[PDB]
Amino acid sequence: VMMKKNHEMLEGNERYEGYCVDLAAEIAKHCGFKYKLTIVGDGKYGARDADTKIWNGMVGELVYGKADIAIAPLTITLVREEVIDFSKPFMSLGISIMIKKPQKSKPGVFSFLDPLAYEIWMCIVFAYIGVSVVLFLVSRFSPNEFGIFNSLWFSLGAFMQQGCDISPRSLSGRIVGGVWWFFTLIIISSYTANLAAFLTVERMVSPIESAEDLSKQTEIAYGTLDSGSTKEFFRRSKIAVFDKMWTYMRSAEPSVFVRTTAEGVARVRKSKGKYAYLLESTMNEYIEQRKPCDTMKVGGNLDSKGYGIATPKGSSLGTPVNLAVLKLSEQGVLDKLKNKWWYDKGECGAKDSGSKEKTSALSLSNVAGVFYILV
Amino acid sequence: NEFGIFNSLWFSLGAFMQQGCDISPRSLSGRIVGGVWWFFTLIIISSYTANLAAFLTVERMVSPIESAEDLSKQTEIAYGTLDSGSTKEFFRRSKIAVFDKMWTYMRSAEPSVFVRTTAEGVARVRKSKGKYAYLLESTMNEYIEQRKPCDTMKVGGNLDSKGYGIATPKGSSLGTPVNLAVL
Amino acid sequence: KLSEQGVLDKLKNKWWYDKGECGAKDSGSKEKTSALSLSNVAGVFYILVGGLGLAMLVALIEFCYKSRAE
Numbered sequence: 001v002m003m004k005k006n007h008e009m010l011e012g013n014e015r016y017e018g019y020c021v022d023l024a025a026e027i028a029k030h031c032g033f034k035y036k037l038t039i040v041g042d043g044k045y046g047a048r049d050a051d052t053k054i055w056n057g058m059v060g061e062l063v064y065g066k067a068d069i070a071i072a073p074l075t076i077t078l079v080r081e082e083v084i085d086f087s088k089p090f091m092s093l094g095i096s097i098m099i100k101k102p103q104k105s106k107p108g109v110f111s112f113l114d115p116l117a118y119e120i121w122m123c124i125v126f127a128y129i130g131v132s133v134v135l136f137l138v139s140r141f142s143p144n145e146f147g148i149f150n151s152l153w154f155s156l157g158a159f160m161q162q163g164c165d166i167s168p169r170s171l172s173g174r175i176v177g178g179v180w181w182f183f184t185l186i187i188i189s190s191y192t193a194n195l196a197a198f199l200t201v202e203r204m205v206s207p208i209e210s211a212e213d214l215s216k217q218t219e220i221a222y223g224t225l226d227s228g229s230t231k232e233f234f235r236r237s238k239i240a241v242f243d244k245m246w247t248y249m250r251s252a253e254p255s256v257f258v259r260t261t262a263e264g265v266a267r268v269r270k271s272k273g274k275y276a277y278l279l280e281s282t283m284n285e286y287i288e289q290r291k292p293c294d295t296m297k298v299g300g301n302l303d304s305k306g307y308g309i310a311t312p313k314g315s316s317l318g319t320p321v322n323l324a325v326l327k328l329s330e331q332g333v334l335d336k337l338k339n340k341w342w343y344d345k346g347e348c349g350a351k352d353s354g355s356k357e358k359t360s361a362l363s364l365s366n367v368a369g370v371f372y373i374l375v
Numbered sequence: 376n377e378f379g380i381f382n383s384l385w386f387s388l389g390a391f392m393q394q395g396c397d398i399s400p401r402s403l404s405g406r407i408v409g410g411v412w413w414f415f416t417l418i419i420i421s422s423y424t425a426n427l428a429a430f431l432t433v434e435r436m437v438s439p440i441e442s443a444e445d446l447s448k449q450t451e452i453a454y455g456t457l458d459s460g461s462t463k464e465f466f467r468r469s470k471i472a473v474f475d476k477m478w479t480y481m482r483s484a485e486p487s488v489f490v491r492t493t494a495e496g497v498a499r500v501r502k503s504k505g506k507y508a509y510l511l512e513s514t515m516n517e518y519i520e521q522r523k524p525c526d527t528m529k530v531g532g533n534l535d536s537k538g539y540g541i542a543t544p545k546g547s548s549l550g551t552p553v554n555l556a557v558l
Numbered sequence: 559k560l561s562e563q564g565v566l567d568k569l570k571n572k573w574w575y576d577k578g579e580c581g582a583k584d585s586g587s588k589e590k591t592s593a594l595s596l597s598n599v600a601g602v603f604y605i606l607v608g609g610l611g612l613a614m615l616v617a618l619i620e621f622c623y624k625s626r627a628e
């Protein structure tokens with residue numbers, strides 16, 4: 001169900017748009033009836049409390065006779081099965097994960113010297129000053145070619161390990177040439193090892209996807225849509241990883257249950273990966289093809305539930321639906337529409353298809369400012 | 376003047392190749408450039424060392440073959456399913472355009488359009504080593520990955536929603552007592 | 559009556575699991591290595607500047623033997 005460019009100027013069933021809107025006409029053509037479209041007054045699919053079990057959501061609208069035939073992406077479950085009637089599943093689906101997409105993090109224009117501290121580089125500069133000054137005082141005691149331009153240049157070639165032009169010949173000149181070598185031998189090797197430290201830590205980082213690691217990770221929070229089936233699929237469960245999720249989500253503070261899907265998307269974008277989200281397979285896929293393009297699907301699908309056309313207990317019109325659901329699956333009119341709205345959204349640009357070339361081999365931005373100092 | 380155009384390539388080369396060159400510049404205008412060229416290489420030689428340790432320390436696995444889209448683009452792999460069953464007909468009922476490219480190439484397969492033994496498609500993929508693929512039941516793939524020859528891998532996800540039912544003849548004497556006993 | 563089935567025991571599973579954990583969760587990936595301190599390499603400067611002053615000591619003792627040339 002979509003909005004419309006003529007949200008106010010247009011009237012009737014044409015006021016909105018979408019898969020089920022056109023699919024309603026597909027049933028209305030085949031079954032031969034007239035329909036009036038309504039919106040759920042709550043804004044939620046269906047709850048069932050430890051209470052009088054009034055279905056706060058679209059189910060109670062359909063149980064209590066306000067609606068006649070419900071058309072919605074609604075989960076076929078046993079708890080709904082005993083209280084309303086379902087058609088055959090027209091779409092395959094599963095529980096899936098939406099997270100903040102781990103994007104290209106911003107490097108530094110002087111990120112190459114990050115394994116050292118700027119306090120160290122400040123001392124390296126200051127040590128480079130005095131050693132040339134001390135050697136020159138050692139050199140020019142005339143009561144020799146190491147002038148002030150030579151003593152800087154000899155110390156510069158010493159520190160870069162690129163050889164030297166000449167050598168000191170007096171004993172005290174060789175002494176300061178000795179200790180400067182043992183100085184720079186540590187510092188270069190210390191720089192190389194700590195540079196390897198960042199790169200080995202970076203590859204050690206595991207992007208969590210199996211959802212058991214997500215259950216073992218407490219920094220990334222995770223929540224579901226309330227008053228539906230995903231909130232209830234983890235209520236009654238059997239797997240210890242599912243129960244630990246439910247033990248985490250029951251004992252969660254603050255409220256990980258979000259009233260609508262869009263605010264559930266909104267918490268993920270603000271969190272920069274702090275807040276994960278659980279939703280259906282098809283609904284997670286459609287947000288990927290839209291264009292913030294910062295949501296991706298990790299892991300495999302949990303189970304295989306289904307969407308079905310809902311009729312109340314005793315509605316005679318549910319069996320002609322059972323005709324048309326089979327017939328439009330035979331011709332593929334389901335698939336004719338199930339294709340149509342999902343390759344239409346190519347507007348993300350398919351950024352995942354052309355950005356899977358990530359590797360630990362450096363970008364130029366890792367070593368960019370070295371060229372800046374060079375040029 | 377010793378820095379010819381044939382000389383200046385050589386001085387810059389050994390500075391890049393960590394080798395001390397005999398001929399040094401003798402000007403403040405010249406010595407700056409060879410100075411910063413030294414500091415150029417001193418990072419990059421070290422950066423090549425540090426990154427190459429990381430490939431040797433942390434290993435990664437290369438498998439771009441998942442999620443059934445990458446199956447559909449790469450035409451180097453041959454698919455494998457079981458005849459006289461669901462997968463023989465479920466892809467024969469290919470209506471989805473990505474599944475149309477499957478079944479046409481599944482009909483354009485040689486020699487194994489199908490296999491006949493589930494344990495033989497296990498054996499064939501072990502000898503296939505990147506030439507042949509095998510599509511099958513999910514918990515069948517999972518169970519063989521729990522058995523330990525450990526040369527097995529599940530990729531992608533469930534292509535269909537399926538389930539196993541107790542086959543009873545139509546008008547069974549005990550079909551509905553079975554169905555309640557299932558419940 | 560408690561100990562025969564473990565009402566002592568099974569409740570001791572729960573209340574000791576209940577209050578959160580501080581274990582192998584933060585030994586593995588709650589660290590990133592930092593830049594080196596100066597204090598990691600400070601003693602080289604003490605060897606460096608300590609080597610600097612003793613060079614001037616031998617510079618002074620050179621001229622003592624240089625004046626001995628007589």
Ligand SMILES: N[C@@H](CCC(=O)O)C(=O)O
Pocket residue numbers: 045073074075225226227228229230231232279280
């Ligand atoms: N399609 C789902 C949405 C709510 C949920 O994921 O729990 C349903 O109607 O049950």
Ligand SMILES: N[C@@H](CCC(=O)O)C(=O)O
Pocket residue numbers: 457458459460461462463512
């Ligand atoms: N259980 C399946 C096995 C064969 C197949 O997957 O195609 C059947 O009898 O149809």
